[PDB]
Design a protein around this ligand. Structure first.
Ligand SMILES: NC(=O)C1=CN([C@@H]2O[C@H](COP(=O)(O)OP(=O)(O)OC[C@H]3O[C@@H](n4cnc5c(N)ncnc54)[C@H](OP(=O)(O)O)[C@@H]3O)[C@@H](O)[C@H]2O)C=CC1
Length: 159
């Protein structure tokens, strides 16, 4: 089982300038709940964007994809191919744009948080993968964040 987990602006933007273009702390707990105790796979830039205090993410086997066969990532496993990254039965791909695209074909689950923020796609942005009709989804109710942003959760599956 390979799952993808991400948060996106309605527009599809998931990252800009090396960061996430919004604040939504309420998301942190759902992320933690889905990923805890499993192997998590991320691209090298996502690793670098993780704050030093939670790098590596505690309670998870952190796997980092990189084409630098010498890249240093303390507390994480550096692999150079996607096949090497996906050996665990329950693996959650947590980013970024490149890695989500690369892993989508292997995925049977996606936990998506939609953020109701006006943020048009700009050139160079990290973007969320587009789910076609092989996916059957379940949409949650909109909620308000203390940040002021409305957000909801989607759970997608495909056998
Ligand atoms: N909103 C959300 O839910 C999330 C948003 N993000 C955002 O995403 C952005 C980063 O995304 P993005 O720029 O797409 O980067 P990625 O995190 O996907 O990392 C890309 C890097 O992964 C490595 N890589 C990619 N493909 C391969 C491959 N096929 N084989 C080996 N190594 C590979 C390379 O490392 P190297 O260059 O070292 O070879 C490459 O530079 C940031 O802005 C981040 O904040 C991240 C996670 C979640």
């Amino acid at each position: 089982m390979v799952g993808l987990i991400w948060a996106q602006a309605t527009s599809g933007v998931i990252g800009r300038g090396g960061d996430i273009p919004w604040r939504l702390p309420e998301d942190q707990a759902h992320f933690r709940e889905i990923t805890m105790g499993h192997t998590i796979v991320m691209g090298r830039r996502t690793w670098d964007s993780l704050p030093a205090k939670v790098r590596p993410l505690p309670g998870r086997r952190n796997v980092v994809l990189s084409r630098q066969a010498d890249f240093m990532a303390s507390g994480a496993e550096v692999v150079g191919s996607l096949e090497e990254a996906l050996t665990s039965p329950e693996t959650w791909v947590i980013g970024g744009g490149q890695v989500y695209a690369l892993a989508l074909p292997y995925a049977t689950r996606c936990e998506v948080t939609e953020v109701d923020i006006g943020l048009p796609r700009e050139a160079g942005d990290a973007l969320a993968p587009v789910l076609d009709e092989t996916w059957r989804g379940e949409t949650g109710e909109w909620r308000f964040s203390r940040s002021g942003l409305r957000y909801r959760l989607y759970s997608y599956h495909r056998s």
